[PDB]
Amino acid sequence: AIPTNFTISVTTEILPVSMTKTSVDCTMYICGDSTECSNLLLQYGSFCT
């Protein structure tokens, strides 16, 4: 079976390339503006880094 005519077809392909970049202030999230909580949290600084 041999084709006798042709078709020219245009199709689309979608790809994700990047995502949102985020940063966290660890003390702002955990303690807010409480000085005592920050003095207590000074024992866990390695984990936030």
- Contacts with another protein, residue ranges (CB under 8 A): 23, 25, 27-28, 32-33, 42, 49
Nearer to another protein, 2 or 28 (CB): 28
Neighbour tally for 31: CB within 10 Å: 15
For residues 46 and 49, give the distance between their C-alpha atoms in angstroms, rounded to a whole number.
5
CB closer to another protein out of 10 and 24: 24
- Min. distance of Cβ 47 from another protein in angstroms? 13
Helices (H), 1-49: 26-30, 35-41, 45-48
Nearer to another protein, 17 or 24 (CB): 24
